[PDB]
Amino acid sequence: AMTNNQKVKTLTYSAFMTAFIIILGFLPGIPIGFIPVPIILQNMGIMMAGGLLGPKYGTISVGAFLALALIGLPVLTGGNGGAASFLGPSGGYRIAWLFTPFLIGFFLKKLKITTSQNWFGELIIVLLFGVIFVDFVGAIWLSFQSNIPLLTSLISNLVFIPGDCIKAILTVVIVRRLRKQGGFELYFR
């Protein structure tokens, strides 16, 4: 049961995480040829949320970001948003983002990664849930909503892997540094 100081801290950090995800969206996306889904930076913030704030508050932070997009603020990459855009080609990735911080936070906590020097374990958890889970759900949704063969969608999504691996690596480096003091231990009890 948090103290007032802990709850003010949690509000501050959660608000920062939501704002950070939004700021990453100020970079324009890079269109690729073969599918109507760009390379972006914003999914990195989604990856970091669960490793900093754990499975509850990480999810709330991402949820708040997504809620802002759903009601119409242009907080997605390139100044996009609105509820209708969630039924579009990139909808699957976005829905997967809501679950990513829960999954990452849950396994970091359960495998005690946050209390160890096992940064490679952390990287694998981030890869599994922030990269593979996200890109797979995204690829399936894309196949259905753009009426393209599933095999084509899955293969085309390999284009995202190099950039997504870099994001996952930077995620582990950044979050482990932020955690080393003090300070985020509350979220992984």
Ligand X SMILES: CCCCCCCCCO[C@@H]1O[C@H](CO)[C@@H](O)[C@H](O)[C@H]1O
Q: How far is the CB of 2 from ligand BTN (least distance, A)?
A: 33
Nearer to ligand X, 84 or 150 (CB): 84
Nearest in space to 63 (alpha carbons), one of 24, 101, 9, 105: 101
102 touches ligand BTN (CB under 6 A): no
- Using CB under 6 A, which of the segments 9-17, 117-125, 133-141, 145-153 binds ligand BTN? 133-141
Contact 50, 101 (CB under 8 A): yes
Structure tokens of 112?
A: 């005690």
Q: How far is the CB of 159 from ligand BTN (least distance, A)?
A: 8
74 touches ligand BTN (CB under 6 A): no
Q: Does residue 183 come out as left (phi exceeding 0), alpha (psi in the -120 to 50 range) or beta?
A: left
* One character per residue 110-129, x = contact with ligand BTN (rule: CB under 6 A): --------------------
# residues contacting ligand BTN (CB under 6 A): 16
Q: How far is the CB of 111 from ligand BTN (least distance, A)?
A: 24
Alpha-carbon Rg for the chain, nearest whole angstrom, is 16
Can you tell me which of 21, 40, 103, 108 binds ligand BTN, judged by CB under 6 A? 40
154 touches ligand BTN (CB under 6 A): no
| Residue ranges binding ligand BTN (CB under 6 A) | 37, 39-40, 43, 76-77, 80, 90, 93-94, 134-135, 138, 160, 163-164
